[PDB]
Amino acid sequence: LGDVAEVRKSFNRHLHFTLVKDRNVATPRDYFFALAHTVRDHLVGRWIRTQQHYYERDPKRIYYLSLEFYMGRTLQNTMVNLGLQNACDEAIYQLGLDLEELEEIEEDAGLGNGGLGRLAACFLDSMATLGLAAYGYGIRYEFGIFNQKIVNGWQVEEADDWLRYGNPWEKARPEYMLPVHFYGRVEHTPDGVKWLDTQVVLAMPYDTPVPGYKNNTVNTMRLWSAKAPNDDFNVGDYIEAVLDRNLAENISRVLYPNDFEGKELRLKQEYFVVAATLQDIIRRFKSSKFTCFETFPDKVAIQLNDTHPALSIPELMRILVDVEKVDWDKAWEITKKTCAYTNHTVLPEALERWPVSMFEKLLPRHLEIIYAINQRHLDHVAALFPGDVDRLRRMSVIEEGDCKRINMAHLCVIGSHAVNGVARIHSEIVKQSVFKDFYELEPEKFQNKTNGITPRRWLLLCNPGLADTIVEKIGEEFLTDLSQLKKLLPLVSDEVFIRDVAKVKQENKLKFSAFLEKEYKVKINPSSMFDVHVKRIHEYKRQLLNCLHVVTLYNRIKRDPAKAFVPRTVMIGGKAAPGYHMAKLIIKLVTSIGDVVNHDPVVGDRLKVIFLENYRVSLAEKVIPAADLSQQISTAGTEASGTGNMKFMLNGALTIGTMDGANVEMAEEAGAENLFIFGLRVEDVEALDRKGYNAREYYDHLPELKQAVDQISSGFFSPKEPDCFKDIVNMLMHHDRFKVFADYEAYMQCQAQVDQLYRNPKEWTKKVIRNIACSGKFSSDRTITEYAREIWGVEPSDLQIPPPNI
Numbered sequence: 001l002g003d004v005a006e007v008r009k010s011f012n013r014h015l016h017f018t019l020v021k022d023r024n025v026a027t028p029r030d031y032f033f034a035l036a037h038t039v040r041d042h043l044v045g046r047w048i049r050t051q052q053h054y055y056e057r058d059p060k061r062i063y064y065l066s067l068e069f070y071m072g073r074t075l076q077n078t079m080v081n082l083g084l085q086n087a088c089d090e091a092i093y094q095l096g097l098d099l100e101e102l103e104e105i106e107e108d109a110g111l112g113n114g115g116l117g118r119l120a121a122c123f124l125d126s127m128a129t130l131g132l133a134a135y136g137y138g139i140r141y142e143f144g145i146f147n148q149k150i151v152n153g154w155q156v157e158e159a160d161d162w163l164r165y166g167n168p169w170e171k172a173r174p175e176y177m178l179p180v181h182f183y184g185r186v187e188h189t190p191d192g193v194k195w196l197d198t199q200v201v202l203a204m205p206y207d208t209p210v211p212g213y214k215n216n217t218v219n220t221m222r223l224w225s226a227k228a229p230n231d232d233f234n235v236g237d238y239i240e241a242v243l244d245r246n247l248a249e250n251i252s253r254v255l256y257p258n259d260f261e262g263k264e265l266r267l268k269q270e271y272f273v274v275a276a277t278l279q280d281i282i283r284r285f286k287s288s289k290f291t292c293f294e295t296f297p298d299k300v301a302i303q304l305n306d307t308h309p310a311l312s313i314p315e316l317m318r319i320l321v322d323v324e325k326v327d328w329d330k331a332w333e334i335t336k337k338t339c340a341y342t343n344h345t346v347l348p349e350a351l352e353r354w355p356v357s358m359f360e361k362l363l364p365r366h367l368e369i370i371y372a373i374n375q376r377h378l379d380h381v382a383a384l385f386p387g388d389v390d391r392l393r394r395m396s397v398i399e400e401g402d403c404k405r406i407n408m409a410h411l412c413v414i415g416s417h418a419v420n421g422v423a424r425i426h427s428e429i430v431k432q433s434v435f436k437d438f439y440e441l442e443p444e445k446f447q448n449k450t451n452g453i454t455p456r457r458w459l460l461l462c463n464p465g466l467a468d469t470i471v472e473k474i475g476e477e478f479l480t481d482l483s484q485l486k487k488l489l490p491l492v493s494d495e496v497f498i499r500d501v502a503k504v505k506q507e508n509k510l511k512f513s514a515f516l517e518k519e520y521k522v523k524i525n526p527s528s529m530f531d532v533h534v535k536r537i538h539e540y541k542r543q544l545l546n547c548l549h550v551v552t553l554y555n556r557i558k559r560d561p562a563k564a565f566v567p568r569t570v571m572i573g574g575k576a577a578p579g580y581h582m583a584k585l586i587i588k589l590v591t592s593i594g595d596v597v598n599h600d601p602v603v604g605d606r607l608k609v610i611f612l613e614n615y616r617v618s619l620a621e622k623v624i625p626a627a628d629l630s631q632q633i634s635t636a637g638t639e640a641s642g643t644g645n646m647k648f649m650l651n652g653a654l655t656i657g658t659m660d661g662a663n664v665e666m667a668e669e670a671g672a673e674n675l676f677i678f679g680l681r682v683e684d685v686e687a688l689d690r691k692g693y694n695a696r697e698y699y700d701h702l703p704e705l706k707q708a709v710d711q712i713s714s715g716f717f718s719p720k721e722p723d724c725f726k727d728i729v730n731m732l733m734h735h736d737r738f739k740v741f742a743d744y745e746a747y748m749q750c751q752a753q754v755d756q757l758y759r760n761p762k763e764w765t766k767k768v769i770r771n772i773a774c775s776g777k778f779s780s781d782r783t784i785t786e787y788a789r790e791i792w793g794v795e796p797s798d799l800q801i802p803p804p805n806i
């Protein structure tokens with residue numbers, strides 16, 4: 001291989017010319033950067049051609065607007081999409097360095113927070129792999145969300161300085177800079193509408209390449225960085241200047257801030273993307289090779305990932321009507337046609353709203369436009385449904401209450417040609433209840449796009465073991481098209497293949513066990529069940545339900561210490577919101593139970609509790625390839641979809657969960673007999689809510705529940721602070737809105753079936769091979785082809801990029 005040789009040549013010249021350092025003064029970070037730069041060079045060749053090919057063969061451009069972009073680590077994905085993974089592994093070894101060591105040096109891209117963020121990052125790869133003409137638009141947050149640190153068993157927020165040493169992937173484009181306008185006043189001149197006396201913030205773009213698997217199509221991600229305009233002056237004009245400089249800087253500083261009026265910043269953040277993005281979008285349309293804006297809805301697609309970029313609608317109206325001199329009605333039919341919405345937040349309350357006063361002050365022009373839109377619309381409603389006063393209020397963009405407020409979700413539907421849902425079941429609720437009146441008027445608008453996960457990151461990267469077990473028995477083709485996993489369905493009875501499936505899982509379990517032993521300092525039993533419950537630390541996610549399970553499990557080994565019980569390694573990961581009092585207590589409860597269960601000799605190795613500190617995109621790639629059991633035990637009627645569960649199924653993990661969200665469509669895809677479904681279903685939940693839930697009906701009338709709960713309340717797990725979980729008890733007893741005790745029995749007797757199925761080796765791995773065979777639907781490429789066809793009006797892989805030279 002001359003590849004292995006070539007990688008070694010460029011690494012040295014990068015270290016010597018780009019980094020300007022010799023091996024004698026180079027840190028492992030200097031070694032990562034030199035490697036990262038070598039891998040980036042191979043992307044550049046495609047990138048330049050891909051972006052010039054789009055200018056040349058002018059296709060319709062897709063624009064994914066999102067605040068969240070949970071990208072994670074780039075190096076590994078980049079060299080796998082380039083096939084150099086093996087050549088680099090050999091070349092890095094040849095330089096007396098470990099690739100795995102360098103990969104761990106790389107920081108997590110502090111651009112996401114949860115499911116919405118990863119959704120974006122997966123989608124971005126799929127569009128690239130499917131040869132699409134797409135772009136990712138977002139904010140270049142400098143400090144991300146935060147780093148989780150468990151101090152004395154509690155969560156401590158640490159600042160994420162992931163840009164301290166700088167990203168070796170992103171390329172700054174200060175020449176493509178744009179102005180974002182704020183505050184000021186409006187004026188109606190004979191020429192047009194003019195927005196003057198405005199405060200200006202600079203938008204500086206940073207582009208990061210998005211490579212496609214195998215294909216020469218490498219897209220671009222434009223993330224904007226807030227900067228302030230430069231310059232006689234007094235103290236009053238010095239202090240305001242130095243303050244304004246910094247205030248602009250904290251727009252692209254931290255994701256989802258609280259500060260209490262850090263609300264205006266969150267609004268400012270949204271308009272910073274919207275304005276910057278759209279000006280750049282339009283610029284590309286008019287800067288295209290060879291009255292002008294008629295071809296706009298045929299050459300531009302704008303997907304509004306949740307209510308965050310809801311301002312794109314009145315902003316596009318603004319730019320077209322006030323700047324481009326376009327007719328309102330012409331520009332409005334364009335707006336509707338060039339905009340598509342997606343709703344993740346189920347039930348009409350988590351739906352984003354903003355006071356009119358706050359809009360009156362910050363975006364006075366956008367308010368006029370929104371007011372105008374929410375009239376030409378209401379008048380059309382008064383045409384179809386005359387005299388219906390209560391429909392008008394139910395459908396208005398402007399809401400009433402303690403003060404007038406603009407419902408951004410209404411504006412998203414009124415302004416979009418297609419509104420979609422994340423899961424079939426969820427999507428129906430969006431139609432039938434969330435936007436009931438908008439649905440009747442236009443049912444053809446409302447759609448569904450079931451979410452997906454990229455098979456490269458969530459399989460080829462993290463679990464190459466399981467991948468190669470499918471590669472030689474099917475052929476690589478399954479990586480392009482995931483539905484080809486049903487081709488291994490007749491291998492449910494193949495004797496040589498079944499043991500080779502568990503061979504991979506165990507070869508992964510040991511690697512993660514070593515990580516667990518080294519980092520957390522606990523004796524890990526690899527022969528035990530790898531129970532996992534990694535997600536947002538929230539009450540509706542029911543982390544406490546899994547707690548109660550391990551409490552009874554601990555008491556069962558204390559009751560019958562002789563009994564040969566099924567060994568486990570209960571893993572609960574995730575992060576609590578900084579203000580969330582209850583979720584912080586929940587993290588403490590897990591650590592309190594662990595400091596009891598792990599530090600006990602009667603228990604030994606048949607039970608280990610371990611809270612996963614700093615659950616990220618990098619950590620998920622470690623835990624999921626080595627996980628036996630997967631928990632998605634959320635209260636039914638809450639989880640809309642969820643993408644986590646999908647990563648497990650593909651990596652050979654039996655899921656436990658209620659009949660809600662992604663669980664419904666998985667049990668539909670693989671059969672409810674092949675998944676540990678338990679607890680109340682949506683209607684039973686509805687019925688219990690009709691009954692009027694009481695906790696004492698469950699606490700007084702149970703043996704091992706009473707024990708487990710009065711253990712927590714007594715302070716059996718917090719001996720030095722016996723009243724530590726007072727608020728946890730008081731909740732589960734009086735103000736528990738996610739019926740935790742109502743699914744206690746159901747969860748445990750379900751867990752008994754889980755316990756017995758794992759007692760048998762072949763029948764567990766047989767039920768597992770069903771899950772891997774049915775995961776095909778849950779491909780991100782499937783969702784992207786569905787967006788490209790049912791919404792964006794584009795042909796997948798119709799425009800392919802040829803191999804260039806120099």
Ligand SMILES: Nc1ncnc2c1ncn2[C@@H]1O[C@H](COP(=O)(O)O)[C@@H](O)[C@H]1O
Nearest residue numbers: 047048049051052053055056283284287
């Ligand atoms: N006049 C032009 N001739 C050839 N390529 C261009 C031109 N303008 C832009 N491009 C391509 O488009 C990319 C950057 O422009 P944009 O797509 O507008 O961000 C570069 O990769 C260029 O190769």
Ligand SMILES: *Cc1c(COP(=O)(O)O)cnc(C)c1O
Nearest residue numbers: 114115535616617620642643644
């Ligand atoms: C996949 C993923 C999620 C989403 O999982 P859910 O169960 O849908 O909440 C969240 N966070 C990280 C870091 C992930 O990798």
